[PDB]
Design a protein around this ligand. Sequence first.
Ligand code: GTP
Ligand code: GTP
Ligand code: GDP
Ligand code: GDP
Ligand code: MG
Ligand code: MG
Ligand code: MG
Lengths: 136, 439, 430, 429, 429
Amino acid sequence: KVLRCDCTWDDTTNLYGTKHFLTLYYFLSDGSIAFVEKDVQNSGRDPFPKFLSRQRIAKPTSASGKFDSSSLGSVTFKEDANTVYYTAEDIRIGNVLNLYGRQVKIHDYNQYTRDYMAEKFGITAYAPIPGATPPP
Amino acid sequence: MREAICIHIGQAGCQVGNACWELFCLEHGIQPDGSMPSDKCIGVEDDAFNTFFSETGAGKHVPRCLFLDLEPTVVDEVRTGTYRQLFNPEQLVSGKEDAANNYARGHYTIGKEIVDLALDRIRKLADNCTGLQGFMVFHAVGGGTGSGLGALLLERLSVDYGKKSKLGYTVYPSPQVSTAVVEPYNCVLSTHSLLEHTDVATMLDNEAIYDLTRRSLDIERPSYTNVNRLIGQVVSSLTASLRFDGALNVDLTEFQTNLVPYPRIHFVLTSYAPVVSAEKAYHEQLSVADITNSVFEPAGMLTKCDPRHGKYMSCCLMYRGDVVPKDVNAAIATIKTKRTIQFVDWCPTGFKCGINYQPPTVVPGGDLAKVQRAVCMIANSTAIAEVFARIDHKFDLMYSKRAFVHWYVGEGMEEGEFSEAREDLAALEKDYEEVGAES
Amino acid sequence: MREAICIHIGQAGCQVGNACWELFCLEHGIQPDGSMPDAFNTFFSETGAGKHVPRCLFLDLEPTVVDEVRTGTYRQLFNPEQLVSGKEDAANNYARGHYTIGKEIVDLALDRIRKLADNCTGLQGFMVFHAVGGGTGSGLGALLLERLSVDYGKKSKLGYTVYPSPQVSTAVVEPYNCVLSTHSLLEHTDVATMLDNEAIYDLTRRSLDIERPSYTNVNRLIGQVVSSLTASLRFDGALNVDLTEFQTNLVPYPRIHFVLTSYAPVVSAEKAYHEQLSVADITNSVFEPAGMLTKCDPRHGKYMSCCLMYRGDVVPKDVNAAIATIKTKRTIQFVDWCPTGFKCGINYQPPTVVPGGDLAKVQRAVCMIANSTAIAEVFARIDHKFDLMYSKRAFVHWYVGEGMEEGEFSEAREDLAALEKDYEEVGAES
Amino acid sequence: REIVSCQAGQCGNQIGSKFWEVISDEHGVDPTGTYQGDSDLQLERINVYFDESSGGRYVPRAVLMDLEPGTMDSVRAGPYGQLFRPDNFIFGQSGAGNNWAKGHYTEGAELIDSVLDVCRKEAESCDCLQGFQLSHSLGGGTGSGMGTLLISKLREEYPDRIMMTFSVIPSPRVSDTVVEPYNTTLSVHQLVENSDESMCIDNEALYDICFRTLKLTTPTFGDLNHLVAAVMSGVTCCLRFPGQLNSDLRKLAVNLVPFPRLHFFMMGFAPLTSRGSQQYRGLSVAELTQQMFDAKNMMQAADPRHGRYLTASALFRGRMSTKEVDEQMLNVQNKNSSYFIEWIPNNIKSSICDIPPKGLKMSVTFIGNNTCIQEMFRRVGEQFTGMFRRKAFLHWYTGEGMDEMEFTEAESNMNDLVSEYQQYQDATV
Amino acid sequence: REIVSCQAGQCGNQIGSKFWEVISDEHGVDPTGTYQGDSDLQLERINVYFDESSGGRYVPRAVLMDLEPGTMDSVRAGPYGQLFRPDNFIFGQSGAGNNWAKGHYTEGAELIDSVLDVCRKEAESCDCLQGFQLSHSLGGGTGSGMGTLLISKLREEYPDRIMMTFSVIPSPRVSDTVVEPYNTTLSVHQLVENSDESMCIDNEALYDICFRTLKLTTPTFGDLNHLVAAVMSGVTCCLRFPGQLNSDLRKLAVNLVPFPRLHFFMMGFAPLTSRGSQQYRGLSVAELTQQMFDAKNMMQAADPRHGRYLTASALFRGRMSTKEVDEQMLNVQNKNSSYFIEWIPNNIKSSICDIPPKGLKMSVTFIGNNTCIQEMFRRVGEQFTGMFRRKAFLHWYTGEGMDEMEFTEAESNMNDLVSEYQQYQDATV
Ligand SMILES: Nc1nc2c(ncn2[C@@H]2O[C@H](COP(=O)(O)OP(=O)(O)OP(=O)(O)O)[C@@H](O)[C@H]2O)c(=O)[nH]1
Ligand SMILES: Nc1nc2c(ncn2[C@@H]2O[C@H](COP(=O)(O)OP(=O)(O)OP(=O)(O)O)[C@@H](O)[C@H]2O)c(=O)[nH]1
Ligand SMILES: Nc1nc2c(ncn2[C@@H]2O[C@H](COP(=O)(O)OP(=O)(O)O)[C@@H](O)[C@H]2O)c(=O)[nH]1
Ligand SMILES: Nc1nc2c(ncn2[C@@H]2O[C@H](COP(=O)(O)OP(=O)(O)O)[C@@H](O)[C@H]2O)c(=O)[nH]1
Ligand SMILES: [Mg+2]
Ligand SMILES: [Mg+2]
Ligand SMILES: [Mg+2]
């Protein structure tokens, strides 16, 4: 069982940045998040199948958007139970996940994702945001 | 990238391929119509199916398989089965007359009039592959088709494609529990192709699978379906290293160079665990150490090859699931401490561990239970001398009185080929003894 | 502007043209009434009523097929004239079709041809479809080509000719007709394309998975090949080529203008949906000897010039990659004095499948025309077929009592011998 | 100041259409013909390539020229096809037949007067021409033959004015016809004397650039034309925009042609990066320098390591310091003196233009005169010798009005050009 | 000054995948490459490991090398994978198949041509390059053979630059491959010749440290990489931050290499605390040095008790008193005179950097040229000789272009290295 969602990360605010189209995969077997960058014709980029491995992303500590690199690489071998991860609650249309410093915003669900949300979280409102499918 | 061409020779090969491909489609989320569903996703849509499935322009997956058989009923069963829309109209070569347990008939009379089309289909498969590791050929040397036509195809592939990877999953007939009468003749004749033109040969004798399923799966009546399901599970476990990411991903040649010490020493064992039913699956603490012990203990393998009667040379353990890279080496250390199994003196390492993050998948109604972690061993050991040393005893007992030889000589084979095969098997046994001898 | 005149000689030409035009109407979206509910100007001429008329002349000496056309679906499409039907068949007699009953019909045939040509402001050339093994197609076709060469001079002349197959043939004097027609086909034909029937038979048998196809399927495949060839000048594409564009690259010597043909992916709908019909795959299938419409092994000869018309979503990058793969392939070999030897024309219009036909809807396709010494064997067998019957003067009385001299058989035999010797010479290494 | 351009054949027509794409983008020219630029610098010298009308419309000084009438319709139907004059569409009813003879002697001969009339009219409209420019392919029929005929006539009428040719040299890897040797051999011996400078473009090299540098999955002829149009628009950058170190069209000729028979030039452009990897590269003058001399960056298929540079030139565009623009050239000369020629220290002309190409921070066009440019002539001559020894495909040419000895003369002066380059490749002091 | 790093094989790539995270955290760089450090001193020497781009992004000077595309894909999918420049991701279609011959002579040699181009580009971009860092494993095929080929080709073209290599010499207890002895035997002899510093790692010792020094229940390859990445960043601390007594790679090399062939060192890191003992343990320099010289803290699977320290270095991180690291190591010398060689007085080198790693109060990295490091080579040679006596697993090597005499030469050279290490253990004054 995998929750599939279309999402976009806009790097255009920086120098020489594009609107990357990404597909999110929320693995419920251990609650991990995987990312696949959608391929567009004549993209001019090195084809890398996986944008992000199957790993649990910790929620940002603050709202400033700055990523905390101490969790990943730091000589202080610390493992605290307060590290809240990106669970299935956050998967919402229009939700902006702060993922490693990237503000990736979710547009559309899948049919199974809609069934999941309507079956446990009670979210019966479906309203996909246009701008998730790269032009063919 | 990392394509692998599957070939299925004979009725046994065709049924094994049916099980393997249904398992592969279920594991990659491919419906029998050949199209993945948009609404339903089982995992990442990464092109991990490229090794086994080719994607057309309509988002439809076609297997990279060639079902070659000299007789038409199994091919027509596939053509009228559930995966009829899955399988290509070509790549499904059906002859007009069976080889009828005759190596000579399947290698000289009917084999040569179909090997051309087989090579054409193989080339059609190959030109669509850019990173082809090699050919996995599933066959049973007991049957005439799978023996003779398989041998001819192996020689043609060796002379055409060169040094490409060649893995033959061969179902040797155990003389104690066997079906055909001339299948010892067929096996002895096919040793030539399985020794020179088969780069790695995997033992898949039938009644080892049979009794393993009988005692471990609580299935008092195992059948060809269960045997093929276990074979498909083993093949999927071997291929998962390249198919999916893992802690220690291994390609074909990567573990092949670790499993083959000498060019002629490549007839290897196989085993799989935890091969357990649903009832006992939830009652057993299926730890990595436990599954490794069950794999290495002599009874739990898929071949009548007791390690107590020989010496291990190289064991390659493929772990699937959430196996910690420390559970594996702890299990290997406790295996070293356990002296019920011995290793050859010139291979202190002896172990090749590869871990993959994809747990095995279960087919609906299959023998296997839903298990989180699993491990499959491919072991080259000197104890594999005894299967040859009794199949050649079978061969000599029949050959002393020249029984059934008239069929082979009529089908275009010289009588000297039998003597050459016997001498080749004797040389293979002699070099097994030499490699197992203490330095 | 960039228009070609289609001519159909004999029964074979009649069915071939019928298939070609029923394909062309569907390609251009023209209903059988001749109206669409400027890319058709090459085949159809718009009238004052907005209805399109094909630029074709169905010239035959017997009325069965012409009456079938007049009573068929495209009766309102085809012109009542330019649909010339005679009164008596030639009956596999080159002498009859070239000396006695061809004269009384060829005058009005040229009248219709002129009525087409003066309308055609930018006539690219003539495309004549016929079978050399028949009577009308051999004799009347040869004499019409004679008159066309005399009148219009150096206008382009493409001829789709159905030569007798090595074994599957339906006439006994067919070799005589073919050999006598070789003289005209060599002297007054700019390019001649071989389309023997048994090769198409085997291709359809092993590719379309049809147990019992027939002349209709053969003609549909021929029409598909013709449409693929003419699509370069009909539709916009990456590399548009006219008739002369590929004629110059295909014909090295005046006596060497007999060319092969192959088309791929020719495939059924059961088979197509499971295959990646990529550019490299279709090119390899084309260069495979089993994918041709004329049986002659290129491994038995020397390739001289190959022209590839690619249609659909094909890209020059993949075309060049396929060309490199073909060149580095060793099983096929080229003549030493033609290093490049490869002409390529890319068009953006994918082929269209006729309803009820056996061709599957393919996103891309390719048709290859090869000039090569490898097809001297068809002549080397047709001449033996001719001499085995001319040794003791079999059926020669039918020709000589019709009004043709006896020595023309020897003249045609010597011409064919020269046409074989020059193939051997051009295949010989420098 | 004014440069008048011409396009020959469908290849040349598409290349010129993309060149006008680039030029109109640089000058802010609306496809409708009006001026939409946001800066006065573009408008200040817009008259170099554009002529203004009574209504303020800007029309390119381009002469389209092709025997094929079909592709001229596509050129007109393109996004900027409305920009050209209608009377500049000079086309014949019949095609070239991929025949140098047909283009140069029979079909183009009756049309060369008509095209020369409008070329002369545009020349008279220009108050003081900087020169004539042509874009064409040497492997075709009308781009090669009657294009070279145009070059001959224009040289006869304007001996002093600078003749640019942008000739698409064919390659075996992109050998998509059969008479490349004949066409190119018959065109080169006209180009040697009739052209002041020639720019050799190789489709195989463009495809390699797309393979490796730009990383385009399925690049097309449009992308290849964009790559060549960047260079043929930056070659005249200093004419249209002010710079710290200006140059004109005669600058490259005078500073890069040591002897009158050596004017077959190298290629080059920078920056060239894939869209994915463009964010990770710091665009600097050092990176530009390291890309100009890279083998795969130059867009003609001949490795420069086997040869030596007679001369080189870099037409830098953008606001950059004058230190590096020549310090890097001095450093590359010093560290690769073997790849340069000993008896010409300071092999590199440098020009600086203030305004960079639109959408790009800083750019540079590399134009060189190397001794490796004779490798393609080696290959073409070998193919021509193989074809000609057996008289193959010769009747097509000889029927239109050629002679047997013309091919021999073309072979002879091809070999003479080859020997002239070769002996200076290994000439000693 | 600046140091350029290379990752070879799956082991090297996934070691660097965590080292670059560690150094990015130390320098305040997010995976997007922008700088968000809270200290001005972090970015003063950020050019040692990073190069600025057009967008201000800091791209690592890392060259990734592997014949398997899967490891590159995993590295890119890593959280900091997007930091690296895509053109440095160079890979072959087929892997080395865990074969030294395949990785060194045929697959690696055909690919090393493009590796050298990237290495030279990085060196030229570097202002004053000091060292080539390498991360690889001798057990594998692609990491060992191809990395050694890289080192051999780089030694010739940068003879005066510091060649630092971090090779994970494997152990019998974590022996997961069988051509392991062959690979390590064929790599050690080259690492002897063409490496200035060869500081080895053992996954057995890393597992031991994780089990008992850290008390982690399931420390995976991530944590195993994390320890070696921490001690890997600790060696270059003085080149990135100011210190009371600065140093660099050659500062350590000159003071730890008494003889050219004795350059195989063992790594060491401190402090290393369990999760529950963070609050209780008192961080003082005495505790630091005790953990340094404790056997269990050494991250190579040998017991220094059987050996004798030839010369050691202690790179202190954090600001502390200087006699508390000088007289402290003097006390170590005095109460551990048997630990140390007699004829080199005060083996310990001490250098202090003021900035401790983020989240600590003080830290230290230990380097030692102890004689005991010969035990690893002895066991490797024993197993290699046992497996070579019967010539098993040798056809795979010899059919790829290799020979048996060179296996014998590699064995002889390892025996010579072991003899050189033993010569200075029992020497008497
Ligand atoms: N594992 C497995 N083995 C099978 C299966 N079916 C047949 N076999 C083997 O096939 C052997 C008998 O050979 P055959 O009856 O001739 O079948 P074949 O090997 O395909 O040869 P042909 O019938 O000539 O095509 C038996 O000893 C079995 O071991 C199967 O479904 N699974
Ligand atoms: N491919 C194809 N060939 C045809 C067709 N119809 C007739 N032919 C050819 O015609 C040859 C026999 O010649 P004929 O029976 O004399 O027919 P003909 O060529 O039109 O000459 P006529 O008798 O004057 O009608 C056969 O060998 C066929 O190859 C057709 O519909 N398709
Ligand atoms: N760079 C580029 N080359 C082209 C383009 N179109 C055609 N070509 C080249 O031009 C050659 C054909 O020349 P052609 O246009 O037929 O010459 P013409 O017949 O005289 O007009 C081919 O080898 C192509 O490689 C294009 O759009 N861009
Ligand atoms: N999944 C995964 N595997 C790794 C990682 N780092 C190393 N490995 C594997 O571990 C093996 C070598 O271990 P190594 O990195 O030397 O352990 P260490 O020295 O203690 O860090 C290689 O074959 C790699 O495949 C990692 O970060 N993730
Ligand atoms: Mg059977
Ligand atoms: Mg008739
Ligand atoms: Mg100036």
